[PDB]
Amino acid sequence: NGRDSAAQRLGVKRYGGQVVKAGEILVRQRGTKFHPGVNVGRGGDDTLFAKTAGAVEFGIKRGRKTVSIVG
Amino acid sequence: EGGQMPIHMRLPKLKGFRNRFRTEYEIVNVGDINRLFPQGGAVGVDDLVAKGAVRKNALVKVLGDGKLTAKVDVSAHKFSGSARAKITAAGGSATE
Amino acid sequence: PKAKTHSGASKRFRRTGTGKIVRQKANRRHLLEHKPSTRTRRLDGRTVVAANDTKRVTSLLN
Amino acid sequence: VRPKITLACEVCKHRNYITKKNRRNDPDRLELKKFCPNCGKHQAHRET
RNA sequence: UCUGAUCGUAUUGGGCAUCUAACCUCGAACCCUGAAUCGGGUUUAGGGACAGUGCCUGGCGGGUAGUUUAACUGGGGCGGUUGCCUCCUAAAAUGUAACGGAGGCGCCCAAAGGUUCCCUCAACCUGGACGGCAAUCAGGUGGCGAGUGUAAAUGCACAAGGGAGCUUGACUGCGAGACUUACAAGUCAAGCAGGGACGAAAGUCGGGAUUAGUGAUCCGGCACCCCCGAGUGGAAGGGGUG
RNA sequence: UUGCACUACGAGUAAAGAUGCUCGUUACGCGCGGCAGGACGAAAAGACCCCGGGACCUUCACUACAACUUGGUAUUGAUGU
RNA sequence: UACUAAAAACACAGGUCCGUGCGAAGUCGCAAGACGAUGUAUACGGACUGACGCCUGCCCGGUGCUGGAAGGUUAAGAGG
RNA sequence: AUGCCGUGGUGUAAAGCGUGGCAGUGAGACGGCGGGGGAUAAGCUCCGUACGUCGAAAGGGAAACAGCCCAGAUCGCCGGC
RNA sequence: GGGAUGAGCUGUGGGUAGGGGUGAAAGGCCAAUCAAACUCCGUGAUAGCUGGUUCUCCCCGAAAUGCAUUUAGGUGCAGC
RNA sequence: GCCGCAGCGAAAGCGAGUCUGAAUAGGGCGACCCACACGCGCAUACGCGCGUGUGAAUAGUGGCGUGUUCUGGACCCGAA
RNA sequence: AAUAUAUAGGGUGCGGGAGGGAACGCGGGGAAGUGAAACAUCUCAGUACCCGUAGGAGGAGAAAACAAUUGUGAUUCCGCA
Ligand SMILES: [Mg+2]
Ligand SMILES: [Mg+2]
Ligand SMILES: [Mg+2]
Ligand SMILES: [Mg+2]
Ligand SMILES: [Mg+2]
Ligand SMILES: [Mg+2]
Ligand SMILES: [Mg+2]
Ligand SMILES: [Mg+2]
Ligand SMILES: [Mg+2]
Ligand SMILES: [Mg+2]
Ligand SMILES: [Mg+2]
Ligand SMILES: [Mg+2]
Ligand SMILES: [Mg+2]
Ligand SMILES: [Mg+2]
Ligand SMILES: [Mg+2]
Ligand SMILES: [Mg+2]
Ligand SMILES: [Mg+2]
Ligand SMILES: [Mg+2]
Ligand SMILES: [Mg+2]
Ligand SMILES: [Mg+2]
Ligand SMILES: [Mg+2]
Ligand SMILES: [Mg+2]
Ligand SMILES: [Mg+2]
Ligand SMILES: [Mg+2]
Ligand SMILES: [Mg+2]
Ligand SMILES: [Mg+2]
Ligand SMILES: [Mg+2]
Ligand SMILES: [Mg+2]
Ligand SMILES: [Mg+2]
Ligand SMILES: [Mg+2]
Ligand SMILES: [Mg+2]
Ligand SMILES: [Mg+2]
Ligand SMILES: [Mg+2]
Ligand SMILES: [Mg+2]
Ligand SMILES: [Mg+2]
Ligand SMILES: [Mg+2]
Ligand SMILES: [Mg+2]
Ligand SMILES: [Mg+2]
Ligand SMILES: [Mg+2]
Ligand SMILES: [Mg+2]
Ligand SMILES: [Mg+2]
Ligand SMILES: [Mg+2]
Ligand SMILES: [Mg+2]
Ligand SMILES: [Mg+2]
Ligand SMILES: [Mg+2]
Ligand SMILES: [Mg+2]
Ligand SMILES: [Mg+2]
Ligand SMILES: [Mg+2]
Ligand SMILES: [Mg+2]
Ligand SMILES: [Mg+2]
Ligand SMILES: [Mg+2]
Ligand SMILES: [Mg+2]
Ligand SMILES: [Mg+2]
Ligand SMILES: [Mg+2]
Ligand SMILES: [Mg+2]
Ligand SMILES: [Mg+2]
Ligand SMILES: [Mg+2]
Ligand SMILES: [Mg+2]
Ligand SMILES: [Mg+2]
Ligand SMILES: [Mg+2]
Ligand SMILES: [Mg+2]
Ligand SMILES: [Mg+2]
Ligand SMILES: [Mg+2]
Ligand SMILES: [Mg+2]
Ligand SMILES: [Mg+2]
Ligand SMILES: [Mg+2]
Ligand SMILES: [Mg+2]
Ligand SMILES: [Mg+2]
Ligand SMILES: [Mg+2]
Ligand SMILES: [Mg+2]
Ligand SMILES: [Mg+2]
Ligand SMILES: [Mg+2]
Ligand SMILES: [Mg+2]
Ligand SMILES: [Mg+2]
Ligand SMILES: [Mg+2]
Ligand SMILES: [Mg+2]
Ligand SMILES: [Mg+2]
Ligand SMILES: [Mg+2]
Ligand SMILES: [Mg+2]
Ligand SMILES: [Mg+2]
Ligand SMILES: [Mg+2]
Ligand SMILES: [Mg+2]
Ligand SMILES: [Mg+2]
Ligand SMILES: [Mg+2]
Ligand SMILES: [Zn+2]
């Protein structure tokens, strides 16, 4: 025993109601623990960035937890 | 730095060489010329060093920043592109 | 006695027209086959020295 | 077993890309149609 | 006519033998010398182009010399460990120690990448030649218990899982804005242009379901651009880009 | 040798073994001869151990050098095969 | 082991092996020179054992030492 | 439950942020609460805690008694709570 | 107490000198010093280590954590 | 002579721009005042650029102090 | 002289040298500690020290020099660069 890897600092970076700029990183994650909504792109390593300015809004989309941005 | 590779050793050297044979020009702008010679007339390198707009014993290049209105007769080295246009529009000449 | 500047520091840093100190970036000399163009383009260019290193690099340059 | 190979443009011979392959699964030089920055279009490339 | 073998001059090189004159002799005699087992000179007896020595060069060389020989650590030594990835400890944001509890990595894939289109598994029940608990077939039931290149976690049935057609974006020039962070690093990125792939189009494509598969700077190598070129023209050398 | 001084004991407390702190107990002031339980008594900036530096020693640790040794060339020539 | 160790330690006569053919080997010296030795293998130097008696077995794979030169590798020089 | 991010009100002088000059520190200790190692021992050991105190804090209480309770010494007073 | 005609003891004179001497060998001795003497000079050697560092008042006032480290009782940057 | 007086670029070079780049694409570094009026395309207004003032704000350098720092023994004392 | 030419050597007569001195000069030989947070290249440093040899100074000095399309015109030393 004795080994470990580095903490990867995952998690939600912008919570509901926050006003973001285009390109903000919203969620660092493995897999789609959250799914992208409107104006949200996913990213190569499942990063859920913002495509437009606006306010972050979390919701449910028939089983999936999604992140959206309202203009 | 305590034994880790220091900042002056873990960074790459800046690229390129330095030209051993490079020529440097002392510069003056047409705005400065207009400010310093409101009456116009001939404008030589000796006149420029006397007015203090340029260092002495150096090659002088004229650049084209500012507004030039006075009719002047500038003699220098290596005029700029804009400097020639501004001088000739004002109505003078630019000899080398 | 006249003050001497640091040779390696003067080879790795330089100043701009407003006094900013700039540097190149590491990891871009070899082993470039497995590095994507995104990473290589990020490592390209020059950047301003970090605020937590500016004092020591200034002391090295002066 | 998986060496680094470099692909050169057929026309201008510029060494444009470097990549890897399995020498046993591919005992012969690769041909790919990559973009050549010199020629400015897509050209065939081959190992060196 | 490879002319392999052979002729006569050259030329010189290589041994081999002999010679003497360089050089050598702590062999002998004489003189300087009156007192000299020093020294030098003369003659003779031998050796001899060798040896010795100079410069260049390979070996050998604890005989001598200068030094190095890590850290962590319930004292030190012995044992173990040192970088990266995943989980628990970790106290429902992030982060968190111990010689705390468990595992992997130092690759693989020319398709296991891109795109378009189609499909649903494992298990169980019944029937059926070899055939059986389990190969292939048929019909039921089955919402994910299968699978995912490879550890674990988070995901994925809308499929990221299974099959097929065509392809090389496993691009070049960039990159607003972010995450993380002592620094150095590391990570994501809409979108613009060139030139392309697939698609009727909408569109997707800057490798792979994601996170490991790696090493700063220095100093060099290679290809390309033709940037500098120690009086000038070249060149050497340097520079830039990969 | 010496920071002091009109320098008790018990059970405690406290850098966890107290003349000097607590609560009690005991003790007229000052000398002389003795004893050696304490003052973690004196003497020596612990020799043990660890950390840093050194010195000397060893060797199939590294890199060197003397010595010994190889060949070439100069000193160095002649004649034959 | 002057100044905490006198011993079972060292030496010793005796033994064996190796070297040395002669300004020898070996040692002190850059060298000259010196000692060895005014000696000459029954001599000198080094190594180990340690009066005397009876004895001293097997292994030459490893590392040394001695000899050899068929083959492999290998410097400067020559050649260009 | 707490804690964390954002936002709108209200409150609060000696908050916060950027940029420079000059630092020191990088041996922590105990107590409360949540855990690992340990025998669910240690005045043990290793972490968490917009928790406290000591460190660097005197005064009062706890017999004495760094770290527990109360309370933060500008100086004076033969005043009071 | 041991030797006390011997490998004896002793006087006078002389020789060997520091990575050197001498040593019937203990790392012994070489001027009360020896696992490399002493003196002067390099020299005010160096020491991440110990100690010391001298008058006053007023204002503010910590840290004993993170990262890295031939690093762990040192240092650099951040935190304060 | 030094510093200030123009920067960008590896450099040739160009220059209020320059480098990269096919790019009149985007970025890097560097320049560039409006609290205001006049004329001007201009909006309900806010002003966008040009010449002046309504009067718009720059700046460096030499000496002397002080704090820190560099090279020197470098705050003082101390080895083997 | 050996030995013939002669030379080595020997006799005579004239001159000179030797040694000292605080620093400074020129030529030659040439450390280590220390710094590199270890160390060998490197540094310390051509320093300390040593050897030879001066003079009032010494050394250098009259282009087989620089420069670069113009040109300067022996050397030395000082300030810049
Ligand atoms: Mg983790
Ligand atoms: Mg390169
Ligand atoms: Mg690339
Ligand atoms: Mg194949
Ligand atoms: Mg010879
Ligand atoms: Mg020879
Ligand atoms: Mg040796
Ligand atoms: Mg040694
Ligand atoms: Mg040394
Ligand atoms: Mg240790
Ligand atoms: Mg232990
Ligand atoms: Mg956790
Ligand atoms: Mg957490
Ligand atoms: Mg929590
Ligand atoms: Mg492992
Ligand atoms: Mg796939
Ligand atoms: Mg699929
Ligand atoms: Mg396909
Ligand atoms: Mg690739
Ligand atoms: Mg960017
Ligand atoms: Mg396109
Ligand atoms: Mg894209
Ligand atoms: Mg990827
Ligand atoms: Mg994978
Ligand atoms: Mg290096
Ligand atoms: Mg030329
Ligand atoms: Mg070239
Ligand atoms: Mg580029
Ligand atoms: Mg007690
Ligand atoms: Mg008591
Ligand atoms: Mg008492
Ligand atoms: Mg009292
Ligand atoms: Mg008494
Ligand atoms: Mg007593
Ligand atoms: Mg007594
Ligand atoms: Mg004592
Ligand atoms: Mg001590
Ligand atoms: Mg010891
Ligand atoms: Mg004794
Ligand atoms: Mg006895
Ligand atoms: Mg005795
Ligand atoms: Mg003995
Ligand atoms: Mg001999
Ligand atoms: Mg014999
Ligand atoms: Mg023997
Ligand atoms: Mg014996
Ligand atoms: Mg014997
Ligand atoms: Mg015996
Ligand atoms: Mg035997
Ligand atoms: Mg054997
Ligand atoms: Mg043998
Ligand atoms: Mg044999
Ligand atoms: Mg042999
Ligand atoms: Mg500050
Ligand atoms: Mg520390
Ligand atoms: Mg600590
Ligand atoms: Mg607890
Ligand atoms: Mg516990
Ligand atoms: Mg404790
Ligand atoms: Mg402790
Ligand atoms: Mg606690
Ligand atoms: Mg303290
Ligand atoms: Mg108190
Ligand atoms: Mg406080
Ligand atoms: Mg109190
Ligand atoms: Mg107060
Ligand atoms: Mg004597
Ligand atoms: Mg011993
Ligand atoms: Mg003595
Ligand atoms: Mg000595
Ligand atoms: Mg010594
Ligand atoms: Mg010195
Ligand atoms: Mg205060
Ligand atoms: Mg290191
Ligand atoms: Mg520049
Ligand atoms: Mg631009
Ligand atoms: Mg001023
Ligand atoms: Mg005669
Ligand atoms: Mg004299
Ligand atoms: Mg040295
Ligand atoms: Mg050092
Ligand atoms: Mg040191
Ligand atoms: Mg004189
Ligand atoms: Mg002279
Ligand atoms: Zn091409």
DSSP codes, C18-55: TS-EEE--SS-SS--SSS-HHHHHHHSS-EEPPTTTHH
Whether A49 and A25 have beta carbons less than 8 Å apart is answered as yes
Cα–Cα distance, B74 to D25 (Å, whole number): 75
Whether B77 and B61 have beta carbons less than 8 Å apart is answered as yes
Q: Across-strand partners of D47?
A: D7
Q: What experiment produced this structure?
A: cryo-EM
C1’ E111 / CA B84, Å: 64
Cα–Cα distance, C58 to C2 (Å, whole number): 18
Residue numbers in C 39-58, CB below 7 Å of strand E:
39-45, 47, 49-50, 52-53
For residue A34, the CA-to-ligand 24 centroid distance in Å is 20
Contacts of D20 in chain C (CB under 8 A): 33
Tokens of B84: 């020639």
DSSP structural state of residue B56: S
Which of A53, A50, A42, A54 has the alpha carbon at shortest distance from A64? A42
Q: How many Cβ pairs within 8 Å bridge chains B and C?
A: 32
- DSSP string over A1-51: ----------EESS-TT-EE-TT-B-EE-SS-SSEE-TTEE-TTTT--EES
Cα–Cα distance, D9 to D41 (Å, whole number): 11
- Output phi, psi for B90, to 5 deg: -65, -30
Total domains in chain D come to: 1
Whether A66 and A34 have beta carbons less than 8 Å apart is answered as yes
Cα–Cα distance, C33 to C39 (Å, whole number): 11
Query: Which residue range is the domain that position D15 belongs to?
Result: 1-48
DSSP structural state of residue B75: E
Burial of D14 per CB tally in 10 Å (0-12, 13-18, 19+): middle
Whether C21 and C14 have beta carbons less than 8 Å apart is answered as yes
C1’ E193 / CA D40, Å: 13
Total domains in chain C come to: 1
Q: Is the CB of B21 under 7 A from strand K?
A: no
Query: Which residue range is the domain that position C38 belongs to?
Result: 1-62
- Output phi, psi for C41, to 5 deg: -65, -40
Q: Is the CB of B8 under 7 A from strand I?
A: no
To one decimal, the resolution in angstroms is 2.7
Cα–Cα distance, B28 to B39 (Å, whole number): 18
